[PDB]
Amino acid sequence: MVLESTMVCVDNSEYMRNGDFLPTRLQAQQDAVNIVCHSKTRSNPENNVGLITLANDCEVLTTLTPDTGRILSKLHTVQPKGKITFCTGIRVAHLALKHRQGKNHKMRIIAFVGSPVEDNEKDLVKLAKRLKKEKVNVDIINFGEEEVNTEKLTAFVNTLNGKDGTGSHLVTVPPGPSLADALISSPILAG
Template structure:
């Protein structure tokens, strides 16, 4: 399904109090809004829907683009019939709201419920339609209640905004029918691919033989389960086809990258690996092991030297006479590998120790 951002514009004018649609125009409209929201969001998880009114003091955005049905239902519950509708201004505001969509890959669509007379002249409507078409905004109009009066103007509007049949006008006359039921088979609900309610067809016109509007959670769970099963089957099919191919060079090279220690076994199993590659892999593993052993040997040598130097210093500090034997210390230090007994720093350290012992003896 197409990924869309849709703004639903509802008519909340005084005309919506009429009871020619069960139970009133306003309530019938709210049920249809819920149907459209479910169809849009369930057809593509990345779809978002907003809600705004077109009457009252001025057109007002009630809910910005969202996928949370709770926000839409809460806003619908708060709508009251008041004032006259302003078709022109509300569509312009809806277009502006779509410009602020977060996902720029979403197509733009405005869905307008018109349940009262459209007072804007046809020429102005055509000019707005051309602007929407230029900005790649599709529009769907549900014309009900005053459909006979509004149809000529709205047809001219749709003819000028339509681009590759992406916009639709649906006129529904009054009657004992439910407004939302009449929308089920229209392109507004089926979308561009023609599947009712945004779902693949099956059973009695519904996927899995159930009405997604009566139990949307069950329909969504069944759809997810079906998609997961399809993905699993595709993965299994790809795996079988890859196992049947004569060349396995790519698979064996990936295995060697994961575990270098098993490279020789893989080389024997995969005949198309060259002997040079196997030798390079073994040499790499061997060099890594040798460097680790050399590092351990260096650490042991440094520890031995540190211990010998520590013992020599302790011998000098624990001299029974309190004085360091210079010749003995020089001989001990000279026997240590890499130690120069004549180094100025070592001589200074011995002198300092000698002076300290002398000072301690004088104090006593």
């Protein structure tokens, strides 16, 4: 096993409600939460997973806790509606992981972005060299629609790592009909 803390960053914006990505996009990101919580059950249960959004608020309803059955109950009535702010999402998740219990856990975090965010590349490079001085690899999986080939988050992937800490893997969004498990099959292959 391995000691880390992955903060699932769901999108509750008003773009995640249609059915281009499979029979609900809510169900698409919900199956994503299913596979990451089962994956951290298959990982070390000493690790912890908590919920957070980037849109409409920074909503903490569960603590970053090693249980996730209550998170599976928190899957329901997510009601995705609001306006995206992922640039506060990185920092709010990072302070949530500076509110942890142990330092031997690593910090490999995922993120789900599904809307056009007003994110300057200077904003996310402040965040990115901040994470260079905060030791966090982030594996973002693009959902929804902002661009068919995301660039700002590609720039964050570029500006997070160098030569040793290349733990930034960006599944850009396939904005046409692509499956529910074919999106998350590549990070469960390689995060």
